[PDB]
Design a protein around this ligand. Structure first.
Ligand SMILES: [Mg+2]
Ligand SMILES: [Mg+2]
Ligand SMILES: [Mg+2]
Ligand SMILES: [Mg+2]
Ligand SMILES: [Mg+2]
Ligand SMILES: [Mg+2]
Ligand SMILES: [Mg+2]
Ligand SMILES: [Mg+2]
Ligand SMILES: [Mg+2]
Ligand SMILES: [Mg+2]
Ligand SMILES: [Mg+2]
Ligand SMILES: [Mg+2]
Ligand SMILES: [Mg+2]
Ligand SMILES: [Mg+2]
Ligand SMILES: [Mg+2]
Ligand SMILES: [Mg+2]
Ligand SMILES: [Mg+2]
Ligand SMILES: [Mg+2]
Ligand SMILES: [Mg+2]
Ligand SMILES: [Mg+2]
Ligand SMILES: [Mg+2]
Ligand SMILES: [Mg+2]
Ligand SMILES: [Mg+2]
Ligand SMILES: [Mg+2]
Ligand SMILES: [Mg+2]
Ligand SMILES: [Mg+2]
Ligand SMILES: [Mg+2]
Ligand SMILES: [Mg+2]
Ligand SMILES: [Mg+2]
Ligand SMILES: [Mg+2]
Ligand SMILES: [Mg+2]
Ligand SMILES: [Mg+2]
Ligand SMILES: [Mg+2]
Ligand SMILES: [Mg+2]
Ligand SMILES: [Mg+2]
Ligand SMILES: [Mg+2]
Ligand SMILES: [Mg+2]
Ligand SMILES: [Mg+2]
Ligand SMILES: [Mg+2]
Ligand SMILES: [Mg+2]
Ligand SMILES: [Mg+2]
Ligand SMILES: [Mg+2]
Ligand SMILES: [Mg+2]
Ligand SMILES: [Mg+2]
Ligand SMILES: [Mg+2]
Ligand SMILES: [Mg+2]
Ligand SMILES: [Mg+2]
Ligand SMILES: [Mg+2]
Ligand SMILES: [Mg+2]
Ligand SMILES: [Mg+2]
Ligand SMILES: [Mg+2]
Ligand SMILES: [Mg+2]
Ligand SMILES: [Mg+2]
Ligand SMILES: [Mg+2]
Ligand SMILES: [Mg+2]
Ligand SMILES: [Mg+2]
Ligand SMILES: [Mg+2]
Ligand SMILES: [Mg+2]
Ligand SMILES: [Mg+2]
Ligand SMILES: [Mg+2]
Ligand SMILES: [Mg+2]
Ligand SMILES: [Mg+2]
Ligand SMILES: [Mg+2]
Ligand SMILES: [Mg+2]
Lengths: 158, 134, 263
RNA sequence: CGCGACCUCAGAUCAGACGUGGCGACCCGCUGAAUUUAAGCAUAUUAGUCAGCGGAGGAGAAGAAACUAACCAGGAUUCCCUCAGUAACGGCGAGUGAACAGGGAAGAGCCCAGCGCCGAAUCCCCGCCCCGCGGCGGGGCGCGGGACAUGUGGCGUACGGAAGACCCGCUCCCCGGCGCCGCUCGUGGGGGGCCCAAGUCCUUCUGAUCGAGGCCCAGCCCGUGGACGGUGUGAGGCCGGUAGCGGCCCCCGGCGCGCCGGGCCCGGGUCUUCCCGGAGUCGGGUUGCUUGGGAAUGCAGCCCAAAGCGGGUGGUAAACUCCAUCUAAGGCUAAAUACCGGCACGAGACCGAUAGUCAACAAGUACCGUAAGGGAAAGUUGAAAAGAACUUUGAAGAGAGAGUUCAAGAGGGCGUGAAACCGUUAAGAGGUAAACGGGUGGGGUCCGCGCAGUCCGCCCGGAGGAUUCAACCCGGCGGCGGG
RNA sequence: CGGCGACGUCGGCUACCCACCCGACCCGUCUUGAAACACGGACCAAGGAGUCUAACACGUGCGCGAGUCGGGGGCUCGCACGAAAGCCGCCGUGGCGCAAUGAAGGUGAAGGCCGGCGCGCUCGCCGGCCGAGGUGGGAUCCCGAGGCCUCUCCAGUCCGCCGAGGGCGCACCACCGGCCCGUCUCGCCCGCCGCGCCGGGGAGGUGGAGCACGAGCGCACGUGUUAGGACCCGAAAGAUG
RNA sequence: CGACCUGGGUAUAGGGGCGAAAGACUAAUCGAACCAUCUAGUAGCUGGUUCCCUCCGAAGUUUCCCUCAGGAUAGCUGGC
RNA sequence: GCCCCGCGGACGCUACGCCGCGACGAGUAGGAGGGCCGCUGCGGUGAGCCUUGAAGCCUAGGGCGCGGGCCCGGGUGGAGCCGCCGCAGGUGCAGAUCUUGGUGGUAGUAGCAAAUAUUCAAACGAGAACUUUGAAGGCCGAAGUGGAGAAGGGUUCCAUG
RNA sequence: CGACUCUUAGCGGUGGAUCACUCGGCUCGUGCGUCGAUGAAGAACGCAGCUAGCUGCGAGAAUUAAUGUGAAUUGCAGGACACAUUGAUCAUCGACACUUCGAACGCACUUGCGGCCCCGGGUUCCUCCCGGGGCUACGCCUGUCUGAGCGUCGCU
């Protein structure tokens, strides 16, 4: 019964909730587990950049968020074409193609091609046979600059 | 302080393992300290007890210097019987009083190939530990 | 408790024509349990009243500003000498109670030289008080793995660990702290402020960048500055015997006027 | 009126394999209530839940848009925060109730059919020997059998693809062991075994000590070890352990190059010429269930039943016309996520034998019931059995001595040993049942080591002693003050 | 001021027993009314009943404050404690607050004074300043005529106390104006890339959980409601196998 | 000597059986068996609801309700 | 004339404390405050207590407190326990035809009454109304209190002790 | 004075509270995440010098081998056990073994009744009996063999 004055409340507790009560006592344990999984993954791909491929710049798709920009799923085939690389060697290098994204604006197209060309200039490529450098790089950069990048490959800012 | 996460410090777990430990682990439990001259001739601080080794008692009612020979290791009851560590029950007969191997001290080893080998292993391990902590 | 405790029975409530209480009784007929009362908080073998659940809200979140507030308060109280003494820390031959040392002690490696440092620094009476304080607990904690209890000793608050934890860590009562990550549960052990602390020079210099002065903010907390005082001079005796207050007062009434007897 | 070939079937203790059943905490597919709430009750709610049935795996399901959206657009699935108790559903009552965007965890993409080209290029089985065995393949040989043109393989799948020229780049893959690496990262990669500091020092307490004092030089000794357990009590140093990129010995693994062994052989841009898709399915009507989905969210039955610049979607039914977005009716897929079963561990502001599991113990046992099923009670001698020899009474149980023990005022259901109830002793009392509240009195048990009764500040007198009192001088230290 | 004090006595109201006088029916419960011929209670031990979660509401305490809050995630030697703690800031996404109103398209909270001029028309043109209006109460504070003195007088030097009156008026209350949104009634102007079935404005009433120099957010505790077994025990029933 | 009595074997199972019909019988249970689960089902009704002092201290009336053994509301109370 | 022959002059004020004055004091349901009332565990603190005796229990012993309760003495016992500041509850019993366990009065009471019946002697034996043997008197009376089986029981069968 | 009854105290019973203990639970967390026709889960019946339960095991039956370990097990007995011409016990477990039911598999659930092929005995090839061994369930897949059809055809 309502006492004097208050909200009309509707608690959704009519449905045998305390079998499907879910607790979070394993939250520190799963944080430790994810942390050591990230560490294991990084030292497995030890020279590769520790977080995944480079992601593109992506405009958020609503009049609430279409002033901001964020990392997207992947680069598209048109801007891969203008960058001048093949859509399979791109994923072997670390570029994260996404084929189903379109480009309806040359400004976003040119921004992502410039970003792609910048990454390609920034990339150090190891040779296949280390005694026989076919077309990869010179041993100077291969020795001094073989360091793992932590965090996202070049991040997306507003 | 213990830090190894796989070894427990639970009192009930430690008591349970101590009480139903198997026989070779019970032997390792029922190890006993050596005398100082024995330690000096060897380099070993303690030793698992044996059937036919002389020993003397340092605690309790039968404390003394009488070097009695061990006659029984009752690992079931975690006790040992020595030659003259006895009491006379009502019948006039005598029974061995059992005491603890952590409350005796070994004065002469029943020596054979395996005991020379394990004394060598213990002394060698203490020597490698000393040269490491040089 | 277990969610099935007291409820794996199948007891029925036996009607009301029989001259027994209407509690649910164990159904059967061949054992002691047969016809005994079940399910109730008052029955032997039933379930407790309101069985405790795991989703009991064990944890409590505190505002970061208040946790930092509590840290700053405990640090100031550690600086004050009467408050450390009042925790009972045996500081009488210590010189300069905010006690700061070199970094060779951060480079220490052995318990012998750590104990020697504490003897030379005159904290060994606090350590001996801890040793004398070691005794058994009273109650069920002994069965529940807390046999032995003892006092708290000083904290060592370092900046780098080059063996200092291992050089310590065996002397009883000694808590190592690492100034960058500071814990109120170890700076105010019972909820009481005033624990004895020994600092290194690197940690003692890092403090002023960890929490900032008032003229500048902290450089390692980003948005944090020290809380302000509500009373800048906490000296009531000085303020009340100051001549301005004394000039503004009136004269005291020190004559007690007890009840007259009505003749 | 025979002999073949195929098709469609049958038989076999034919040669070789595979399925069944269990468990079910989590997962998937169905089926699916009523108690309850609505202060009645029927729709609603409970609830797509319990019960029921089937099928799995270490996860499963899902999953690379016939998507969201309407923006300057995003971009598989799963999970968390938020959206949000909101849009919406609802005797619009009670109640119910998502999604997108955004921030994160994780992050991975692919393969057929069809359309076409290549002398079926393809696959299975059986013998020969060679190179191997240790989850059994490599290639060669067979004028050896079968599958298969009623379509196997290679290219190739919506992000387009194929074939000719023209130009450019000569660019380098996979699988098996040998050998030793890297000595194989949280430092060993994993499993197993065996070890590794320092008091039983001196004196005392005790039944026993792990108790209590002490141990020159800052000092018993070690400490990267002062967790814990045992041991006649409370033990860093008695013992096992504990700490340590501490040691030693076996077995297994992922691993880099010098081989050998086998295969495996051309990629990209320009133009030209071609080729392009899943049907009793979509969709429509109707019915039933379902959903927040409301003039149909999904699913299913029945009927009707497509198209190819088509089809689907664009949260109000319909027509016309623009635009946006995807490409259904085929298939695979790790991670992040779940886990009251199991194997093995660790911990706890939890319970402490009427509690905590039903179960600390010969517990799902004894016992009950025809059966489905129901289901207890029950821990503690002592440090050590040293568990009471022997004498004596009794037929014995049971006693009396004696003996062990620190203790039997611990004697095999034996720690402590309450209350109810009872026996005996002592004291008191007693015809309005006892008991009770106030107020006295009498008796008794114990207590006041009750029983000559204070203490102590000043000065007076006596009789003793002894440094030395004041005052100076020297040294030290504090407090206060100093333009 | 008196008496008496060790193998006999002094004190001990509290404690055990007994005696007498007065008073006194057995508790719990429901009930207008219980000693009741109302029910439960032979006795004793032990167990035995408002709890926890979620959501609100108000009160209180603490921190920050027009903001507040990391709760999810991530970064930190090798994880005794530590499953803790610390940190992030281009991790503040987001929540709640900072703006309301309307069913919705939508719209969306500052006035006065001084000057000139139309027609200073109940009112535009520009310019100048000031900055949430006014009235009545209003804790506190400010000025304050005049007073109160000193061995004593003459001319002022310093501060002290009382003080009639006056002044600015906090919070808050009452009222009166104003402003925003919805909706009526009346009426005339203005704007343009689209001269429109366009857009904007005024006056006067009314509906609003509004504004009118912010008060919130987070945490903690209490109390009260609620949904959950829901203070504990209790049906006759219903359903599935 | 009969629509007779009786053993064993078989068959019918819970809104079902079986009944020369009494709602009889269906394992001491029958106007719907037993067993487990849903389930600690719901109860405006009965009973109970555990330490001490201090301070304040009621109502049985108003209106509405498928309401009359109940609630909401206003009064009466307490606390800040 | 800055005191002095002197060098001196009680207690107090845990300010959440102490002191003064005046008025007042019923209480169910209920509300609120205080609790140096009580229970169990946690963080601190008591250089706390304890085998020269902890907890628990008993007490014609001594006391305190309005009370909740608490302290001390004596006995018993034989290993742990408490005080203060905070923290947290499965935290206080006379009731519930409460639950489990135990024990009373009743009460040495009701009862040991269906089917006709026993008696004498001996033996064994510590011990004989009841065992065994002998003698007598009786009963079942062949639709049996007799001799065998089926279901069911599961060793009850038989010797010895 | 008895007795009887009531109260209090001491002692002694009855009874098993209290306290202290804890090889047990409960709760949370972690890593693994594995059953079966090559016979599982479960059941039955056996097995020890003295052994009923519990536990372990399977006619090799409170266990064999092997490997680590290194002198016991223990309530009593027994005889082993040079510890190098080789080792008690315990642990590990990779070799071997593993009765009868049970998805349970020749049929059937009675320890009932078979069938086929080998081996040995009685035979003194000839099979009659006895013992032993190997097969003998259902569904399904690929291949093989044997077939059926007035199903569709070819050569007469
Ligand atoms: Mg229980
Ligand atoms: Mg206790
Ligand atoms: Mg076959
Ligand atoms: Mg209802
Ligand atoms: Mg109702
Ligand atoms: Mg009804
Ligand atoms: Mg189910
Ligand atoms: Mg299956
Ligand atoms: Mg899958
Ligand atoms: Mg799939
Ligand atoms: Mg909200
Ligand atoms: Mg629903
Ligand atoms: Mg990531
Ligand atoms: Mg093909
Ligand atoms: Mg596709
Ligand atoms: Mg040692
Ligand atoms: Mg010990
Ligand atoms: Mg120890
Ligand atoms: Mg180690
Ligand atoms: Mg529409
Ligand atoms: Mg007990
Ligand atoms: Mg129990
Ligand atoms: Mg039980
Ligand atoms: Mg059980
Ligand atoms: Mg005793
Ligand atoms: Mg005793
Ligand atoms: Mg006893
Ligand atoms: Mg008595
Ligand atoms: Mg009543
Ligand atoms: Mg009533
Ligand atoms: Mg009445
Ligand atoms: Mg009454
Ligand atoms: Mg009457
Ligand atoms: Mg009644
Ligand atoms: Mg009664
Ligand atoms: Mg009762
Ligand atoms: Mg109780
Ligand atoms: Mg944290
Ligand atoms: Mg914000
Ligand atoms: Mg924002
Ligand atoms: Mg005003
Ligand atoms: Mg107004
Ligand atoms: Mg309220
Ligand atoms: Mg209830
Ligand atoms: Mg409730
Ligand atoms: Mg019930
Ligand atoms: Mg019904
Ligand atoms: Mg029925
Ligand atoms: Mg009738
Ligand atoms: Mg019947
Ligand atoms: Mg009947
Ligand atoms: Mg009163
Ligand atoms: Mg005592
Ligand atoms: Mg309780
Ligand atoms: Mg009671
Ligand atoms: Mg009561
Ligand atoms: Mg009689
Ligand atoms: Mg009679
Ligand atoms: Mg006759
Ligand atoms: Mg007969
Ligand atoms: Mg007694
Ligand atoms: Mg063997
Ligand atoms: Mg048969
Ligand atoms: Mg034919």
């Amino acid at each position: 019964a309502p006492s004097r004055n208050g909200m009309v409340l509707k608690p959704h507790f009519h449905k045998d909730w305390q079998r499907r009560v879910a607790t979070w006592f394993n939250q520190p344990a799963r944080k430790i587990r994810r942390r050591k999984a990230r560490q294991a993954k990084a030292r497995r791909i030890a020279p590769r950049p520790a977080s995944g491929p480079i992601r593109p710049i992506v405009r958020c798709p609503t009049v609430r968020y279409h002033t901001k920009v964020r990392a997207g799923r992947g680069f598209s085939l048109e801007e891969l074409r203008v960058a001048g690389i093949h859509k399979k060697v791109a994923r072997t290098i670390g570029i994260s193609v996404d084929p189903r994204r379109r480009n309806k604006s040359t400004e976003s197209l040119q921004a992502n091609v410039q970003r792609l060309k910048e990454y390609r200039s920034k990339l150090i490529l190891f040779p296949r046979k280390p005694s026989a450098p076919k077309k990869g790089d010179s041993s100077a950069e291969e020795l001094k600059l073989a360091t793992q990048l932590t965090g996202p490959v070049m991040p997306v800012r507003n | 302080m213990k830090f190894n996460p796989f070894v427990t410090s639970d009192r009930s777990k430690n008591r349970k393992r101590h009480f139903n430990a198997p026989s070779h682990i019970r032997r390792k439990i029922m190890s006993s300290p050596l005398s100082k001259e024995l330690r000096q001739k060897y380099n070993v601080r303690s030793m698992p007890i044996r059937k036919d080794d002389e020993v003397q008692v340092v605690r309790g009612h039968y404390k003394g210097q009488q070097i009695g020979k061990v006659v029984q290791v009752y690992r079931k009851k975690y006790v040992i019987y020595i030659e003259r560590v006895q009491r006379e029950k009502a019948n006039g007969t005598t029974v061995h009083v059992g005491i603890h191997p952590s409350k005796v001290v070994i004065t002469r080893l029943k020596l054979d190939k395996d005991r020379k080998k394990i004394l060598e292993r213990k002394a060698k391990s203490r020597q490698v530990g000393k040269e490491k902590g040089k | 408790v277990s969610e099935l405790a007291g409820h794996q029975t199948s007891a029925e409530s036996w009607g009301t024509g029989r001259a027994v209480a209407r509690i649910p009784r164990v159904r059967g007929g061949g054992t002691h349990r047969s016809g005994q009362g079940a399910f109730g908080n008052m029955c032997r073998g039933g379930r407790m009243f309101a069985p405790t659940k795991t989703w009991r809200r064990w944890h409590r979140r505190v505002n970061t500003t208040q946790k930092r507030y509590a840290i700053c308060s405990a640090l100031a109280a550690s600086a004050l000498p009467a408050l450390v003494m009042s925790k009972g820390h045996r500081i009488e031959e210590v010189p300069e109670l905010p006690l700061v040392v070199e970094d060779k002690v951060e480079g220490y490696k052995k318990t012998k030289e750590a104990v020697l440092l504490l003897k030379k620094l005159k904290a060994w009476n606090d350590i001996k008080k801890v040793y004398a304080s070691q005794r058994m607990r009273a109650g069920k904690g002994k069965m529940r793995n807390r046999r032995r209890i003892q006092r708290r000793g000083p904290c060592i608050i370092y900046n780098e660990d080059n063996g200092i934890i291992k050089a310590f860590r065996n002397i009883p009562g000694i808590t190592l702290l690492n100034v960058s990550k500071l814990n109120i549960l170890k700076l105010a052990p019972g909820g009481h402020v005033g624990r004895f602390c020994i600092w290194t020079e690197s940690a003692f210099r890092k403090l002023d960048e960890l929490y900032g002065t008032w003229r500048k903010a902290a450089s390692l907390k980003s948005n944090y500055n020290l809380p302000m005082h509500k009373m800048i001079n906490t000296d009531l005796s000085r303020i009340l015997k100051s001549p301005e207050i004394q000039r503004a007062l009136r004269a005291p009434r020190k004559k007690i006027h007890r009840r007259v007897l009505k003749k």
